[PDB]
Amino acid sequence: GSHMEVVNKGDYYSIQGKYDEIIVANKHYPLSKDYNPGENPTAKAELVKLIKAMQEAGFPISDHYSGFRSYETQTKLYQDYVNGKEAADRYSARPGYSEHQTGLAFDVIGTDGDLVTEEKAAQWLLDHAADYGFVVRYLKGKEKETGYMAEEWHLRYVGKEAKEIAESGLSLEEYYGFEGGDYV
Ligand SMILES: [Cl-]
Ligand SMILES: [Zn+2]
Ligand SMILES: [Zn+2]
Ligand SMILES: [Zn+2]
């Protein structure tokens, strides 16, 4: 990511990547509370293949996943988690702030009902998410940069540039040189 500024497109901010334009949603850059594209079909088709490949490799992964969540959905979920604001902020997006609202983010689930955390499966996603155009967004040890505690299961579709990204070991923030961190 060498080196472009973030542009406001109106409903969202984006940064121009090496091959694609990359929507930026985090604690610094919110989405328009209206922006409601639903699930991205191109990302979805890749997720399907990713899922199948994990199942083929022996992993107990569900066909089900958590993808598009609108602003309103995010509101319920964030509120529910307050029940403190402090602790919920560590791991749950405020509405307008979630990559899930872009329709480009997807949480992988085990056939046991839980978000994937099992170690071999987590490593497989670090190793191969990029083969399907995805990155593990909330990397371990990058909580300062991304704004969020690490998530083994949360995939963000970025396309072809995922392999160079994964190779860097960087957060998107660091790779494209935009701000993440805490709400301001
Ligand atoms: Cl691809
Ligand atoms: Zn700023
Ligand atoms: Zn691979
Ligand atoms: Zn997620």
Residue numbers in the entry: -4 to -1, 56 to 134, 137 to 237
Tell me, in the authors' exact words, what the paper reports.
We report biochemical properties and crystal structures of the LD-carboxypeptidases LdcB from Streptococcus pneumoniae, Bacillus anthracis, and Bacillus subtilis. The enzymes are active against bacterial cell wall tetrapeptides and adopt a zinc-carboxypeptidase fold characteristic of the LAS superfamily. LD-carboxypeptidases subsequently hydrolyze the L-Lys[A2pm]—D-Ala bond to release the tripeptide. The LdcB enzymes are single domain proteins comprising two subdomains separated by a V-shaped cleft.
The crystal structures of SpLdcB and Bacillus anthracis LdcB (BaLdcB) were solved by single wavelength anomalous dispersion (SAD); BsLdcB was solved by molecular replacement. In SpLdcB, the liganding residues are His153, Asp160, and His207; the equivalents in BsLdcB/BaLdcB are His185/His160, Asp192/Asp167, and His244/His219. The active site of SpLdcB contains unattributed residual electron density that occupies the position of the fourth ligand in the tetrahedral coordination sphere of the zinc. To use the nomenclature common to proteases, the unattributed electron density extends as far as the S1′ subsite, the location ordinarily occupied by the scissile amino acid. The electron density in the S1′ subsite is of a size, shape, and location corresponding to that of alanine. The ligand is stabilized in this position by van der Waals’ contacts between the alanyl methyl group and the phenolic side chains of Tyr191 and Tyr201 and by hydrogen bonds to the side chains of Glu204 and the main chain amide nitrogen of Tyr144. Despite the high resolution of the SpLdcB diffraction data, it was not possible to discriminate between either alanyl stereoisomer, both of which are present in the crystallization conditions. We have modeled D-Ala because it is the enzymatic product of these enzymes. However, residual electron density adjacent to the zinc ion could not be modeled satisfactorily with any ligand arising from the enzymatic activity, the crystallization media, or purification media; consequently, the remaining electron density has been left unmodeled. First and foremost, substrates are occluded in the empty form of the enzyme by a loop between residues Gly163 and Glu171, which blocks access to the active site.
